[PDB]
Amino acid sequence: RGGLGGQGAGGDVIEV
Amino acid sequence: RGGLGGQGAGGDVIEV
Amino acid sequence: RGGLGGQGAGGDVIEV
Amino acid sequence: AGGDVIEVGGAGQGGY
Amino acid sequence: AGGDVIEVGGAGQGGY
Amino acid sequence: AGGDVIEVGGAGQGGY
Amino acid sequence: GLGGQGAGGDVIEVGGAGQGGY
Amino acid sequence: GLGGQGAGGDVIEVGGAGQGGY
Amino acid sequence: GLGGQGAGGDVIEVGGAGQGGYG
Amino acid sequence: GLGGQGAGGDVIEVGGAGQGGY
Amino acid sequence: GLGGQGAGGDVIEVGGAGQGGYG
Amino acid sequence: GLGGQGAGGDVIEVGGAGQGGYG
Amino acid sequence: QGAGGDVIEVGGAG
Amino acid sequence: QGAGGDVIEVGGAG
Amino acid sequence: QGAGGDVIEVGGAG
């Protein structure tokens, strides 16, 4: 239920 | 239920 | 239920 | 002697 | 003497 | 004397 | 001719940001 | 001609960021 | 130094600067 | 001609970041 | 030193700078 | 030293710089 | 002179 | 002079 | 001079 990207970068992702 | 991108960047994402 | 982007940037996203 | 040019900004903070 | 050019920014913080 | 050029940024922090 | 031009084209820059708190 | 041009084309830069907190 | 000559040159300097926080 | 150009093309740069906290 | 001559050159300096946090 | 000559050259200096934290 | 001279002294922003 | 001279002294930003 | 001279002294950013 998550997605990062496009051009390059990042961060934090938490689910459930 | 989330999405980051377009051009490149990032942040925080939390769900449920 | 969320979305960031267009041109590149980011922030905070919280759901439920 | 030119064509499409783009520039971007952005920021963001918050959460809980 | 040119063509498509892109530039990007971004940031982000938060969470819980 | 040119063509497609890209540049990117980004950051991110948070979590729990 | 007796001379030459120099450095055609285009140029761009960017600025910087920064945030934060408790 | 009696001279020449120099360094045509394009140029770009970027800036820097930084964040953080307790 | 009689006679025509050349022109000037492009000069593009700086961008922004950002700070700030909880202190 | 009696001279020549020099170093055509393109150039790109980047900046730096830094984060962190307790 | 009479006679036509050349032109100037592109000059492109700086970007941004960013700081900040909990002090 | 009479006579035509050439032109200048591209010059490109710096980018950004970042810091920051809980102190 | 015989042509135009340029000087630039950009101070410090914030 | 016979042509234009350039000087640049970019100070320090923040 | 007979042509243009360039000088650049980029200070320190932050």
Describe the protein's architecture and organization.
15 copies of one chain form a homo-oligomer. Chain A is about 0% helix and about 25% strand. Chain A contains no helices and 1 strand. Chain A is elongated. Chain A has one strand at about 10-15. With about 15 residues, chain A is an all-beta fold. The interface between I and K is medium-sized, with 23 and 23 residues. Strand 1 (about 10) of chain I pairs parallel with strand 1 of chain K, so a sheet runs across the interface.
| Biggest beta sheet attributes of chain A | none
Helical segment count of chain A: 0
Oligomer type: homo-oligomer of 15 chains
Q: Kindly state the percentage of residues in helix of chain A.
A: under 10%
Given the C-alpha coordinates, what overall shape of chain A results? elongated
Number of strand elements of chain A: 1
Strand content of the residues of chain A, in percent? Answer: 25-35%
Rg of chain A computed from alpha carbons, rounded to a whole number of angstroms: 9 Å
Helix-strand pattern of chain A: E
